[PDB]
């Protein structure tokens, strides 16, 4: 019984320019076991509707998931992803790097 | 131009929180096409790509019957495995299985696969001859004996050489406009100054399918593998994939650096520099 | 198409 902590990447489906429809992605991979807590945050508040992909795993048996929601970037809007998992003492927040 | 089908079974126990959940998902190459989840309100094998929807009731009924039965079998299996390791009734545990076939451009079986893991650790795998097993420990030797008596190896060979490749070929034709279309990546190089000494060159690849790709940086034609930072290839949500490779260069030397992109959708391999 | 259900582990 060994556990693996999630890798986290936050990014948009397409290149982002403010005012246009787009998709915010939180892709969590490399973890084990599969129970994972993931939220997409808009200046700190949990975006209500979020979908996610069906659970699956890589060749090394580690799991991966994509969490996504349609959105519309603006300049002053900040977005991030909050991830909790058994290997994590406290929830990890990862900001959307609008530069990247 | 070769293809694969894979099925991914996950069974997780959760004592005190109901019976173990069973999940199955089917992939053709990097395209998921079915799912099954014993936790759903009405458990059924469900389409997840348009080209599977045309299949008829006997299809969906067979896939749902087998998956409902596996939901029960995999629970018995999680119990047996707990026994084989003298594990408490209280802990959570994971059984995973992935299997499928690889065919070449002509459709001929290149090789079959069946691999199992318990709590993230290789447990038992069907050998490439499709008639013998490799057990990782004495717990898995028990499973090996059971499967020997049950003649499971014969059944895998017949499936892996038979239905697997036949249905893979059927899937590849019904979804040919996506499964057999490789979309090349769109690329560009960025430049993020760090200090007055150095900057980051980031080579980007976006919108490609399938996910297999090669991003490398060279300084004077010499590959920079120790010095390059690779993100894990990530899904864009629209079937395509994204990736980037980064390298930190001395400021002023940016043109001694080239980024090379290898992808099946590309006519010819790419060489990109930073264009300021 | 999945394989027919097999023996438990």
From TrEMBL, chain B:
Primary site of residence: membrane
Residue ranges constituting the Ig-like domain according to the UniProt record: 185-271
Record has tRNA-binding as a keyword: no
A Gene Ontology cellular-component term: lumenal side of endoplasmic reticulum membrane
Top-rank taxon, per record: Eukaryota
Keyword Transmembrane appears in the UniProt entry: yes
Matches recorded under Gene3D superfamilies: Immunoglobulins (2.60.40.10), MHC class I-like antigen recognition-like (3.30.500.10)
Gene Ontology terms: biological process: antigen processing and presentation of peptide antigen via MHC class I
Signal peptide (from-to): none
Family recorded in the similarity comment: Belongs to the MHC class I family.
Matches recorded under PANTHER family: HLA CLASS I HISTOCOMPATIBILITY ANTIGEN, B ALPHA CHAIN (PTHR16675:SF270), MHC CLASS I-RELATED (PTHR16675)
Designated name of the protein: MHC class I antigen
Source organism of the structure: Homo sapiens (Human)
